[PDB]
């Protein structure tokens, strides 16, 4: 049905190996860079997280049975709610491992400025909102980085896997198949040329005999 | 010995064999081993292609059968196994696959060796 020609195809399939092997060489160290730096961000992430998780909650959990009627008061003095449509600051960024968007969680929420209410807890709960915001930026960058480094990792293992099967020995067997048929064609050459020789000698053998 | 049966294909597989001409379950355990390994090695293709996986929990059992058939069965050194010893223990690796997901072996033989 669809079968490869020998003479036309030859020159394409020899440069096929040149093109492939070199391309894949550098393709290799292309993602390697990006994963080495990625360890750096995942580790560093949680640094702020242990520190500020606990000092947020410090006041929160100590303002639940002194709240549920001082809930009103606390929300009043403080800076009103973050917008539900893009209260966060979304950033777009094109990078290898496809176009993945990032973002940083910084918005207003105030701190140490609610008037009236519980002496200590009110103000301490308001201040705590910062320790959500700030802390959240770390996870804001690593969970979006996670989706980028997903793309790379998967495409990487894909190409290796694929290459060692369909591609590489296939781009081989093409030269081989070609070769062998070019070669074998030249049996008929020699056989014909043989019989040609036989004629020639047979002709000069009628001058001197029969 | 390294024998891979997946590119292997024989001419007869129910001739010179049958109930009492070899063992009653020889004929049964033939086709069984074949499609069982198959569905193991198959997965190991598709894992690279997407994520680091390509399996559920209903794939994970056929998965261990490609390890099980491996160094336990295929490998043996040069030790002589008997026609008994072969199929007998071939049913201890077939305990790891669900018996309700077997379709290449008959049910009356499930009750003879489990």
PDB file of C-alpha atoms in Angstrom:
ATOM      1  CA  UNK A   1       0.000   0.000   0.000  1.00  0.00           C
ATOM      2  CA  UNK A   2       2.456   2.619   1.307  1.00  0.00           C
ATOM      3  CA  UNK A   3       6.031   1.326   0.969  1.00  0.00           C
ATOM      4  CA  UNK A   4       9.189   3.243   0.894  1.00  0.00           C
ATOM      5  CA  UNK A   5      11.148   3.853  -2.277  1.00  0.00           C
ATOM      6  CA  UNK A   6      14.967   3.228  -2.233  1.00  0.00           C
ATOM      7  CA  UNK A   7      16.779   5.810  -4.435  1.00  0.00           C
ATOM      8  CA  UNK A   8      14.731   8.911  -3.540  1.00  0.00           C
ATOM      9  CA  UNK A   9      14.433   8.054   0.153  1.00  0.00           C
ATOM     10  CA  UNK A  10      18.092   7.235   0.851  1.00  0.00           C
ATOM     11  CA  UNK A  11      19.479  10.733   1.223  1.00  0.00           C
ATOM     12  CA  UNK A  12      16.608  11.820   3.629  1.00  0.00           C
ATOM     13  CA  UNK A  13      17.035   8.780   5.879  1.00  0.00           C
ATOM     14  CA  UNK A  14      20.842   9.278   6.181  1.00  0.00           C
ATOM     15  CA  UNK A  15      20.418  12.847   7.416  1.00  0.00           C
ATOM     16  CA  UNK A  16      17.536  11.588   9.526  1.00  0.00           C
ATOM     17  CA  UNK A  17      20.079  10.088  12.038  1.00  0.00           C
ATOM     18  CA  UNK A  18      22.136  13.470  11.946  1.00  0.00           C
ATOM     19  CA  UNK A  19      19.022  15.492  12.783  1.00  0.00           C
ATOM     20  CA  UNK A  20      17.636  13.180  15.418  1.00  0.00           C
ATOM     21  CA  UNK A  21      20.653  12.166  17.702  1.00  0.00           C
ATOM     22  CA  UNK A  22      21.987  15.810  17.886  1.00  0.00           C
ATOM     23  CA  UNK A  23      18.550  17.354  18.574  1.00  0.00           C
ATOM     24  CA  UNK A  24      17.863  14.932  21.396  1.00  0.00           C
ATOM     25  CA  UNK A  25      21.302  15.494  22.903  1.00  0.00           C
ATOM     26  CA  UNK A  26      20.602  19.042  23.997  1.00  0.00           C
ATOM     27  CA  UNK A  27      16.848  18.405  24.547  1.00  0.00           C
ATOM     28  CA  UNK A  28      18.218  16.294  27.456  1.00  0.00           C
ATOM     29  CA  UNK A  29      19.895  19.161  29.386  1.00  0.00           C
ATOM     30  CA  UNK A  30      17.091  21.529  28.547  1.00  0.00           C
ATOM     31  CA  UNK A  31      14.693  20.416  31.419  1.00  0.00           C
ATOM     32  CA  UNK A  32      17.566  19.284  33.828  1.00  0.00           C
ATOM     33  CA  UNK A  33      18.318  22.962  34.753  1.00  0.00           C
ATOM     34  CA  UNK A  34      14.757  23.708  35.622  1.00  0.00           C
ATOM     35  CA  UNK A  35      14.341  20.735  38.003  1.00  0.00           C
ATOM     36  CA  UNK A  36      17.583  21.482  39.942  1.00  0.00           C
ATOM     37  CA  UNK A  37      16.282  24.991  40.829  1.00  0.00           C
ATOM     38  CA  UNK A  38      12.785  23.603  41.652  1.00  0.00           C
ATOM     39  CA  UNK A  39      14.142  21.731  44.728  1.00  0.00           C
ATOM     40  CA  UNK A  40      15.259  25.174  46.018  1.00  0.00           C
ATOM     41  CA  UNK A  41      11.708  26.675  45.908  1.00  0.00           C
ATOM     42  CA  UNK A  42       9.870  23.577  47.415  1.00  0.00           C
ATOM     43  CA  UNK A  43      12.157  23.412  50.488  1.00  0.00           C
ATOM     44  CA  UNK A  44      12.279  27.208  51.057  1.00  0.00           C
ATOM     45  CA  UNK A  45       8.481  27.293  50.749  1.00  0.00           C
ATOM     46  CA  UNK A  46       7.660  25.744  54.063  1.00  0.00           C
ATOM     47  CA  UNK A  47      10.079  27.954  56.064  1.00  0.00           C
ATOM     48  CA  UNK A  48       7.645  30.804  56.461  1.00  0.00           C
ATOM     49  CA  UNK A  49       4.708  28.357  56.599  1.00  0.00           C
ATOM     50  CA  UNK A  50       5.685  26.745  59.924  1.00  0.00           C
ATOM     51  CA  UNK A  51       6.441  30.181  61.452  1.00  0.00           C
ATOM     52  CA  UNK A  52       3.320  32.025  60.436  1.00  0.00           C
ATOM     53  CA  UNK A  53       0.710  29.183  60.501  1.00  0.00           C
ATOM     54  CA  UNK A  54       0.976  28.828  64.142  1.00  0.00           C
ATOM     55  CA  UNK A  55       1.018  32.585  65.014  1.00  0.00           C
ATOM     56  CA  UNK A  56      -2.099  33.191  62.871  1.00  0.00           C
ATOM     57  CA  UNK A  57      -4.028  30.541  64.608  1.00  0.00           C
ATOM     58  CA  UNK A  58      -2.608  31.621  68.005  1.00  0.00           C
ATOM     59  CA  UNK A  59      -5.368  34.204  68.348  1.00  0.00           C
ATOM     60  CA  UNK A  60      -8.057  32.693  66.066  1.00  0.00           C
ATOM     61  CA  UNK A  61      -8.688  29.574  68.200  1.00  0.00           C
ATOM     62  CA  UNK A  62      -8.480  31.690  71.266  1.00  0.00           C
ATOM     63  CA  UNK A  63     -11.353  33.861  69.975  1.00  0.00           C
ATOM     64  CA  UNK A  64     -14.209  31.484  69.240  1.00  0.00           C
ATOM     65  CA  UNK A  65     -16.260  31.335  72.525  1.00  0.00           C
ATOM     66  CA  UNK A  66     -15.436  35.083  73.088  1.00  0.00           C
ATOM     67  CA  UNK A  67     -16.508  35.576  69.532  1.00  0.00           C
ATOM     68  CA  UNK A  68     -19.915  34.404  68.025  1.00  0.00           C
ATOM     69  CA  UNK A  69     -21.174  37.736  69.285  1.00  0.00           C
ATOM     70  CA  UNK A  70     -17.888  39.704  68.909  1.00  0.00           C
ATOM     71  CA  UNK A  71     -17.705  38.372  65.406  1.00  0.00           C
ATOM     72  CA  UNK A  72     -19.655  41.553  64.357  1.00  0.00           C
ATOM     73  CA  UNK A  73     -17.144  43.888  66.155  1.00  0.00           C
ATOM     74  CA  UNK A  74     -13.944  42.437  64.687  1.00  0.00           C
ATOM     75  CA  UNK A  75     -15.107  42.458  61.075  1.00  0.00           C
ATOM     76  CA  UNK A  76     -16.336  46.102  61.428  1.00  0.00           C
ATOM     77  CA  UNK A  77     -13.022  47.840  62.440  1.00  0.00           C
ATOM     78  CA  UNK A  78     -10.941  45.843  60.114  1.00  0.00           C
ATOM     79  CA  UNK A  79     -10.557  46.479  56.404  1.00  0.00           C
ATOM     80  CA  UNK A  80     -13.470  45.030  54.470  1.00  0.00           C
ATOM     81  CA  UNK A  81     -13.258  41.676  52.464  1.00  0.00           C
ATOM     82  CA  UNK A  82     -10.845  40.885  49.598  1.00  0.00           C
ATOM     83  CA  UNK A  83     -12.673  40.930  46.197  1.00  0.00           C
ATOM     84  CA  UNK A  84     -13.989  37.506  45.058  1.00  0.00           C
ATOM     85  CA  UNK A  85     -13.029  38.344  41.384  1.00  0.00           C
ATOM     86  CA  UNK A  86      -9.338  38.594  41.250  1.00  0.00           C
ATOM     87  CA  UNK A  87      -8.660  39.836  44.799  1.00  0.00           C
ATOM     88  CA  UNK A  88      -5.282  38.133  44.369  1.00  0.00           C
ATOM     89  CA  UNK A  89      -2.739  39.546  41.841  1.00  0.00           C
ATOM     90  CA  UNK A  90      -2.522  37.068  38.826  1.00  0.00           C
ATOM     91  CA  UNK A  91       0.597  37.084  36.711  1.00  0.00           C
ATOM     92  CA  UNK A  92       1.047  35.518  33.323  1.00  0.00           C
ATOM     93  CA  UNK A  93       4.377  34.167  32.323  1.00  0.00           C
ATOM     94  CA  UNK A  94       5.529  32.153  29.328  1.00  0.00           C
ATOM     95  CA  UNK A  95       8.152  29.607  30.224  1.00  0.00           C
ATOM     96  CA  UNK A  96       9.232  26.101  29.010  1.00  0.00           C
ATOM     97  CA  UNK A  97       6.957  23.336  30.388  1.00  0.00           C
ATOM     98  CA  UNK A  98       4.083  25.241  28.762  1.00  0.00           C
ATOM     99  CA  UNK A  99       2.508  28.627  29.565  1.00  0.00           C
ATOM    100  CA  UNK A 100       1.620  28.394  33.193  1.00  0.00           C
ATOM    101  CA  UNK A 101       0.179  31.353  35.133  1.00  0.00           C
ATOM    102  CA  UNK A 102       1.427  32.287  38.627  1.00  0.00           C
ATOM    103  CA  UNK A 103       0.233  34.775  41.262  1.00  0.00           C
ATOM    104  CA  UNK A 104       1.007  36.312  44.658  1.00  0.00           C
ATOM    105  CA  UNK A 105      -1.470  36.630  47.524  1.00  0.00           C
ATOM    106  CA  UNK A 106      -1.135  40.206  48.825  1.00  0.00           C
ATOM    107  CA  UNK A 107      -4.256  42.302  49.382  1.00  0.00           C
ATOM    108  CA  UNK A 108      -5.325  44.711  52.109  1.00  0.00           C
ATOM    109  CA  UNK A 109      -6.715  43.373  55.344  1.00  0.00           C
ATOM    110  CA  UNK A 110      -5.250  45.829  57.811  1.00  0.00           C
ATOM    111  CA  UNK A 111      -3.434  45.300  61.014  1.00  0.00           C
ATOM    112  CA  UNK A 112      -3.679  46.606  64.588  1.00  0.00           C
ATOM    113  CA  UNK A 113      -6.390  49.090  63.905  1.00  0.00           C
ATOM    114  CA  UNK A 114      -9.884  47.719  64.795  1.00  0.00           C
ATOM    115  CA  UNK A 115     -11.444  50.025  67.411  1.00  0.00           C
ATOM    116  CA  UNK A 116     -13.500  48.676  70.474  1.00  0.00           C
ATOM    117  CA  UNK A 117     -13.955  44.970  71.327  1.00  0.00           C
ATOM    118  CA  UNK A 118     -11.859  42.384  73.230  1.00  0.00           C
ATOM    119  CA  UNK A 119      -8.661  44.097  74.608  1.00  0.00           C
ATOM    120  CA  UNK A 120      -6.068  41.719  73.268  1.00  0.00           C
ATOM    121  CA  UNK A 121      -7.702  39.193  71.009  1.00  0.00           C
ATOM    122  CA  UNK A 122      -9.490  41.639  68.578  1.00  0.00           C
ATOM    123  CA  UNK A 123      -6.332  43.512  67.497  1.00  0.00           C
ATOM    124  CA  UNK A 124      -4.246  40.240  67.551  1.00  0.00           C
ATOM    125  CA  UNK A 125      -6.820  38.480  65.234  1.00  0.00           C
ATOM    126  CA  UNK A 126      -6.712  41.493  62.835  1.00  0.00           C
ATOM    127  CA  UNK A 127      -2.921  41.375  62.636  1.00  0.00           C
ATOM    128  CA  UNK A 128      -3.143  37.629  61.994  1.00  0.00           C
ATOM    129  CA  UNK A 129      -4.803  38.147  58.662  1.00  0.00           C
ATOM    130  CA  UNK A 130      -1.255  39.173  57.343  1.00  0.00           C
ATOM    131  CA  UNK A 131       0.119  35.788  58.411  1.00  0.00           C
ATOM    132  CA  UNK A 132      -2.397  34.149  55.946  1.00  0.00           C
ATOM    133  CA  UNK A 133      -1.641  36.490  53.141  1.00  0.00           C
ATOM    134  CA  UNK A 134       2.173  36.565  53.323  1.00  0.00           C
ATOM    135  CA  UNK A 135       2.449  32.791  54.107  1.00  0.00           C
ATOM    136  CA  UNK A 136       0.144  31.905  51.183  1.00  0.00           C
ATOM    137  CA  UNK A 137       2.519  33.466  48.624  1.00  0.00           C
ATOM    138  CA  UNK A 138       5.041  30.667  49.013  1.00  0.00           C
ATOM    139  CA  UNK A 139       2.446  27.959  48.183  1.00  0.00           C
ATOM    140  CA  UNK A 140       1.105  30.338  45.465  1.00  0.00           C
ATOM    141  CA  UNK A 141       4.311  29.894  43.516  1.00  0.00           C
ATOM    142  CA  UNK A 142       5.249  26.368  44.280  1.00  0.00           C
ATOM    143  CA  UNK A 143       1.850  24.771  43.448  1.00  0.00           C
ATOM    144  CA  UNK A 144       1.867  26.658  40.119  1.00  0.00           C
ATOM    145  CA  UNK A 145       5.591  25.602  39.605  1.00  0.00           C
ATOM    146  CA  UNK A 146       4.376  22.013  40.282  1.00  0.00           C
ATOM    147  CA  UNK A 147       2.079  22.125  37.258  1.00  0.00           C
ATOM    148  CA  UNK A 148       5.025  23.494  35.117  1.00  0.00           C
ATOM    149  CA  UNK A 149       7.506  20.818  36.150  1.00  0.00           C
ATOM    150  CA  UNK A 150       4.742  18.301  35.529  1.00  0.00           C
ATOM    151  CA  UNK A 151       4.821  19.084  31.772  1.00  0.00           C
ATOM    152  CA  UNK A 152       8.594  18.825  31.534  1.00  0.00           C
ATOM    153  CA  UNK A 153       8.979  15.477  33.507  1.00  0.00           C
ATOM    154  CA  UNK A 154       6.151  13.709  31.490  1.00  0.00           C
ATOM    155  CA  UNK A 155       7.552  15.005  27.964  1.00  0.00           C
ATOM    156  CA  UNK A 156      11.092  14.027  29.092  1.00  0.00           C
ATOM    157  CA  UNK A 157      10.279  10.321  29.958  1.00  0.00           C
ATOM    158  CA  UNK A 158       8.010  10.306  26.873  1.00  0.00           C
ATOM    159  CA  UNK A 159      10.795  11.063  24.436  1.00  0.00           C
ATOM    160  CA  UNK A 160      13.322   8.679  25.926  1.00  0.00           C
ATOM    161  CA  UNK A 161      10.836   5.763  26.048  1.00  0.00           C
ATOM    162  CA  UNK A 162       9.538   6.494  22.517  1.00  0.00           C
ATOM    163  CA  UNK A 163      13.053   6.950  20.951  1.00  0.00           C
ATOM    164  CA  UNK A 164      14.358   3.549  22.166  1.00  0.00           C
ATOM    165  CA  UNK A 165      11.335   1.850  20.486  1.00  0.00           C
ATOM    166  CA  UNK A 166       9.557   3.233  17.319  1.00  0.00           C
ATOM    167  CA  UNK A 167      12.005   5.936  16.281  1.00  0.00           C
ATOM    168  CA  UNK A 168      15.686   5.093  16.559  1.00  0.00           C
ATOM    169  CA  UNK A 169      15.888   1.382  15.304  1.00  0.00           C
ATOM    170  CA  UNK A 170      13.116   2.345  12.780  1.00  0.00           C
ATOM    171  CA  UNK A 171      15.252   5.106  11.356  1.00  0.00           C
ATOM    172  CA  UNK A 172      17.919   2.442  11.269  1.00  0.00           C
ATOM    173  CA  UNK A 173      15.854  -0.374   9.452  1.00  0.00           C
ATOM    174  CA  UNK A 174      14.987   2.172   6.734  1.00  0.00           C
ATOM    175  CA  UNK A 175      18.792   2.461   5.621  1.00  0.00           C
ATOM    176  CA  UNK A 176      19.079  -1.301   6.050  1.00  0.00           C
ATOM    177  CA  UNK A 177      15.998  -2.207   3.862  1.00  0.00           C
ATOM    178  CA  UNK A 178      17.077   0.387   1.275  1.00  0.00           C
ATOM    179  CA  UNK A 179      20.729  -0.855   1.251  1.00  0.00           C
ATOM    180  CA  UNK A 180      19.912  -4.551   0.833  1.00  0.00           C
ATOM    181  CA  UNK A 181      17.519  -3.962  -2.106  1.00  0.00           C
ATOM    182  CA  UNK A 182      20.098  -1.578  -3.825  1.00  0.00           C
ATOM    183  CA  UNK A 183      22.670  -4.334  -3.268  1.00  0.00           C
ATOM    184  CA  UNK A 184      20.643  -7.300  -4.371  1.00  0.00           C
ATOM    185  CA  UNK A 185      19.693  -5.388  -7.623  1.00  0.00           C
ATOM    186  CA  UNK A 186      23.329  -5.720  -8.502  1.00  0.00           C
ATOM    187  CA  UNK A 187      23.218  -9.514  -8.736  1.00  0.00           C
ATOM    188  CA  UNK A 188      21.191  -8.978 -12.047  1.00  0.00           C
ATOM    189  CA  UNK A 189      23.793  -6.525 -13.107  1.00  0.00           C
ATOM    190  CA  UNK A 190      26.606  -9.045 -12.751  1.00  0.00           C
ATOM    191  CA  UNK A 191      24.545 -11.985 -14.205  1.00  0.00           C
ATOM    192  CA  UNK A 192      23.590 -10.002 -17.260  1.00  0.00           C
ATOM    193  CA  UNK A 193      27.166  -8.684 -17.655  1.00  0.00           C
ATOM    194  CA  UNK A 194      28.318 -12.375 -17.483  1.00  0.00           C
ATOM    195  CA  UNK A 195      26.127 -13.427 -20.341  1.00  0.00           C
ATOM    196  CA  UNK A 196      27.422 -10.223 -22.210  1.00  0.00           C
ATOM    197  CA  UNK A 197      30.934 -11.399 -21.723  1.00  0.00           C
ATOM    198  CA  UNK A 198      29.959 -14.820 -23.080  1.00  0.00           C
ATOM    199  CA  UNK A 199      28.635 -13.301 -26.273  1.00  0.00           C
ATOM    200  CA  UNK A 200      31.806 -11.196 -26.816  1.00  0.00           C
ATOM    201  CA  UNK A 201      34.133 -14.161 -26.522  1.00  0.00           C
ATOM    202  CA  UNK A 202      31.795 -16.366 -28.483  1.00  0.00           C
ATOM    203  CA  UNK A 203      32.061 -13.873 -31.369  1.00  0.00           C
ATOM    204  CA  UNK A 204      35.973 -13.841 -31.459  1.00  0.00           C
ATOM    205  CA  UNK A 205      35.830 -17.611 -31.137  1.00  0.00           C
ATOM    206  CA  UNK A 206      34.069 -17.838 -34.613  1.00  0.00           C
ATOM    207  CA  UNK A 207      37.097 -16.234 -36.244  1.00  0.00           C
ATOM    208  CA  UNK A 208      39.362 -18.875 -34.947  1.00  0.00           C
ATOM    209  CA  UNK A 209      36.940 -21.827 -34.785  1.00  0.00           C
ATOM    210  CA  UNK A 210      33.193 -22.567 -34.313  1.00  0.00           C
TER     211      UNK A 210
ATOM    212  CA  UNK B   1      16.727 -19.337  30.710  1.00  0.00           C
ATOM    213  CA  UNK B   2      15.237 -16.210  29.169  1.00  0.00           C
ATOM    214  CA  UNK B   3      12.118 -17.121  27.288  1.00  0.00           C
ATOM    215  CA  UNK B   4       9.761 -14.363  26.211  1.00  0.00           C
ATOM    216  CA  UNK B   5       6.435 -15.959  24.849  1.00  0.00           C
ATOM    217  CA  UNK B   6       4.938 -12.731  23.572  1.00  0.00           C
ATOM    218  CA  UNK B   7       6.726 -12.705  20.079  1.00  0.00           C
ATOM    219  CA  UNK B   8       6.445 -16.498  20.167  1.00  0.00           C
ATOM    220  CA  UNK B   9       3.674 -18.300  18.405  1.00  0.00           C
ATOM    221  CA  UNK B  10       3.415 -21.975  17.949  1.00  0.00           C
ATOM    222  CA  UNK B  11       1.715 -24.140  15.353  1.00  0.00           C
ATOM    223  CA  UNK B  12      -0.261 -26.501  17.675  1.00  0.00           C
ATOM    224  CA  UNK B  13      -1.202 -25.989  21.321  1.00  0.00           C
ATOM    225  CA  UNK B  14      -4.108 -28.382  21.714  1.00  0.00           C
ATOM    226  CA  UNK B  15      -2.632 -31.227  19.756  1.00  0.00           C
ATOM    227  CA  UNK B  16      -0.609 -33.918  21.596  1.00  0.00           C
ATOM    228  CA  UNK B  17      -2.283 -32.486  24.736  1.00  0.00           C
ATOM    229  CA  UNK B  18      -5.656 -32.710  26.326  1.00  0.00           C
ATOM    230  CA  UNK B  19      -7.338 -34.462  29.327  1.00  0.00           C
ATOM    231  CA  UNK B  20      -5.232 -37.550  30.154  1.00  0.00           C
ATOM    232  CA  UNK B  21      -2.802 -37.116  27.287  1.00  0.00           C
ATOM    233  CA  UNK B  22      -0.762 -34.766  29.417  1.00  0.00           C
ATOM    234  CA  UNK B  23      -2.684 -33.339  32.358  1.00  0.00           C
ATOM    235  CA  UNK B  24      -6.336 -32.309  32.442  1.00  0.00           C
ATOM    236  CA  UNK B  25      -5.489 -28.694  33.162  1.00  0.00           C
ATOM    237  CA  UNK B  26      -2.477 -28.515  30.673  1.00  0.00           C
ATOM    238  CA  UNK B  27      -4.939 -27.601  27.877  1.00  0.00           C
ATOM    239  CA  UNK B  28      -6.591 -25.093  30.164  1.00  0.00           C
ATOM    240  CA  UNK B  29      -3.504 -23.402  31.580  1.00  0.00           C
ATOM    241  CA  UNK B  30      -2.074 -22.844  28.009  1.00  0.00           C
ATOM    242  CA  UNK B  31      -3.895 -19.846  26.788  1.00  0.00           C
ATOM    243  CA  UNK B  32      -4.276 -18.520  30.377  1.00  0.00           C
ATOM    244  CA  UNK B  33      -0.523 -17.830  31.006  1.00  0.00           C
ATOM    245  CA  UNK B  34      -0.332 -16.175  27.523  1.00  0.00           C
ATOM    246  CA  UNK B  35      -2.942 -13.353  27.885  1.00  0.00           C
ATOM    247  CA  UNK B  36      -2.076 -12.918  31.568  1.00  0.00           C
ATOM    248  CA  UNK B  37       1.565 -11.810  31.131  1.00  0.00           C
ATOM    249  CA  UNK B  38       0.414  -9.794  28.066  1.00  0.00           C
ATOM    250  CA  UNK B  39      -1.728  -7.396  29.955  1.00  0.00           C
ATOM    251  CA  UNK B  40       1.212  -6.748  32.417  1.00  0.00           C
ATOM    252  CA  UNK B  41       4.012  -5.883  30.019  1.00  0.00           C
ATOM    253  CA  UNK B  42       1.434  -3.645  28.129  1.00  0.00           C
ATOM    254  CA  UNK B  43       1.168  -1.188  31.046  1.00  0.00           C
ATOM    255  CA  UNK B  44       4.995  -0.504  31.287  1.00  0.00           C
ATOM    256  CA  UNK B  45       4.686   1.070  27.796  1.00  0.00           C
ATOM    257  CA  UNK B  46       2.048   3.640  28.628  1.00  0.00           C
ATOM    258  CA  UNK B  47       3.477   4.698  32.040  1.00  0.00           C
ATOM    259  CA  UNK B  48       6.247   6.992  30.533  1.00  0.00           C
ATOM    260  CA  UNK B  49       3.858   8.523  28.012  1.00  0.00           C
ATOM    261  CA  UNK B  50       1.531  10.203  30.504  1.00  0.00           C
ATOM    262  CA  UNK B  51       2.537  11.060  34.187  1.00  0.00           C
ATOM    263  CA  UNK B  52       4.592   8.489  35.983  1.00  0.00           C
ATOM    264  CA  UNK B  53       1.698   6.102  35.910  1.00  0.00           C
ATOM    265  CA  UNK B  54      -0.794   4.571  33.593  1.00  0.00           C
ATOM    266  CA  UNK B  55      -2.732   2.202  36.026  1.00  0.00           C
ATOM    267  CA  UNK B  56      -5.785   1.964  38.397  1.00  0.00           C
ATOM    268  CA  UNK B  57      -6.012  -0.905  41.014  1.00  0.00           C
ATOM    269  CA  UNK B  58      -7.481  -3.369  38.444  1.00  0.00           C
ATOM    270  CA  UNK B  59      -4.319  -3.118  36.482  1.00  0.00           C
ATOM    271  CA  UNK B  60      -1.988  -3.290  39.552  1.00  0.00           C
ATOM    272  CA  UNK B  61      -2.731  -7.087  39.966  1.00  0.00           C
ATOM    273  CA  UNK B  62      -1.797  -7.940  36.288  1.00  0.00           C
ATOM    274  CA  UNK B  63       1.261  -5.666  37.059  1.00  0.00           C
ATOM    275  CA  UNK B  64       2.572  -8.032  39.798  1.00  0.00           C
ATOM    276  CA  UNK B  65       1.957 -11.012  37.459  1.00  0.00           C
ATOM    277  CA  UNK B  66       4.746  -9.625  35.138  1.00  0.00           C
ATOM    278  CA  UNK B  67       7.012  -9.653  38.142  1.00  0.00           C
ATOM    279  CA  UNK B  68       5.700 -13.070  39.333  1.00  0.00           C
ATOM    280  CA  UNK B  69       6.145 -14.823  35.989  1.00  0.00           C
ATOM    281  CA  UNK B  70       9.623 -13.333  35.916  1.00  0.00           C
ATOM    282  CA  UNK B  71      12.337 -14.507  38.317  1.00  0.00           C
ATOM    283  CA  UNK B  72      10.094 -17.188  39.917  1.00  0.00           C
ATOM    284  CA  UNK B  73       8.968 -19.139  36.796  1.00  0.00           C
ATOM    285  CA  UNK B  74      10.958 -18.094  33.661  1.00  0.00           C
ATOM    286  CA  UNK B  75      14.150 -18.298  35.716  1.00  0.00           C
ATOM    287  CA  UNK B  76      14.972 -21.703  37.272  1.00  0.00           C
ATOM    288  CA  UNK B  77      18.611 -22.203  36.372  1.00  0.00           C
ATOM    289  CA  UNK B  78      18.933 -25.588  34.720  1.00  0.00           C
ATOM    290  CA  UNK B  79      16.828 -27.495  37.276  1.00  0.00           C
ATOM    291  CA  UNK B  80      14.491 -30.086  35.873  1.00  0.00           C
ATOM    292  CA  UNK B  81      10.879 -29.363  36.492  1.00  0.00           C
ATOM    293  CA  UNK B  82       8.336 -31.986  36.094  1.00  0.00           C
ATOM    294  CA  UNK B  83       5.030 -31.535  34.118  1.00  0.00           C
ATOM    295  CA  UNK B  84       3.278 -31.623  37.516  1.00  0.00           C
ATOM    296  CA  UNK B  85       5.505 -29.031  39.304  1.00  0.00           C
ATOM    297  CA  UNK B  86       5.070 -26.645  36.310  1.00  0.00           C
ATOM    298  CA  UNK B  87       1.239 -26.117  36.027  1.00  0.00           C
ATOM    299  CA  UNK B  88       0.733 -26.780  39.828  1.00  0.00           C
ATOM    300  CA  UNK B  89       2.542 -23.741  40.963  1.00  0.00           C
ATOM    301  CA  UNK B  90       1.498 -21.830  37.828  1.00  0.00           C
ATOM    302  CA  UNK B  91      -1.857 -21.657  39.802  1.00  0.00           C
ATOM    303  CA  UNK B  92      -0.143 -19.807  42.809  1.00  0.00           C
ATOM    304  CA  UNK B  93       0.674 -16.871  40.573  1.00  0.00           C
ATOM    305  CA  UNK B  94      -2.825 -16.984  39.173  1.00  0.00           C
ATOM    306  CA  UNK B  95      -4.154 -16.448  42.683  1.00  0.00           C
ATOM    307  CA  UNK B  96      -3.020 -12.845  42.449  1.00  0.00           C
ATOM    308  CA  UNK B  97      -5.368 -12.167  39.583  1.00  0.00           C
ATOM    309  CA  UNK B  98      -9.182 -11.968  40.233  1.00  0.00           C
ATOM    310  CA  UNK B  99     -10.862 -15.255  39.416  1.00  0.00           C
ATOM    311  CA  UNK B 100     -13.935 -13.250  38.318  1.00  0.00           C
ATOM    312  CA  UNK B 101     -11.829 -11.464  35.641  1.00  0.00           C
ATOM    313  CA  UNK B 102     -10.663 -14.772  34.049  1.00  0.00           C
ATOM    314  CA  UNK B 103     -12.142 -15.404  30.758  1.00  0.00           C
ATOM    315  CA  UNK B 104      -9.332 -17.569  29.073  1.00  0.00           C
ATOM    316  CA  UNK B 105      -9.877 -20.602  31.262  1.00  0.00           C
ATOM    317  CA  UNK B 106     -13.064 -22.590  32.180  1.00  0.00           C
ATOM    318  CA  UNK B 107     -14.822 -22.344  35.549  1.00  0.00           C
ATOM    319  CA  UNK B 108     -14.907 -26.078  36.361  1.00  0.00           C
ATOM    320  CA  UNK B 109     -11.148 -25.976  36.460  1.00  0.00           C
ATOM    321  CA  UNK B 110     -11.295 -23.055  38.981  1.00  0.00           C
ATOM    322  CA  UNK B 111     -12.811 -25.453  41.404  1.00  0.00           C
ATOM    323  CA  UNK B 112     -10.076 -28.093  40.758  1.00  0.00           C
ATOM    324  CA  UNK B 113      -7.022 -25.893  41.449  1.00  0.00           C
ATOM    325  CA  UNK B 114      -7.547 -22.393  42.748  1.00  0.00           C
TER     326      UNK B 114
END
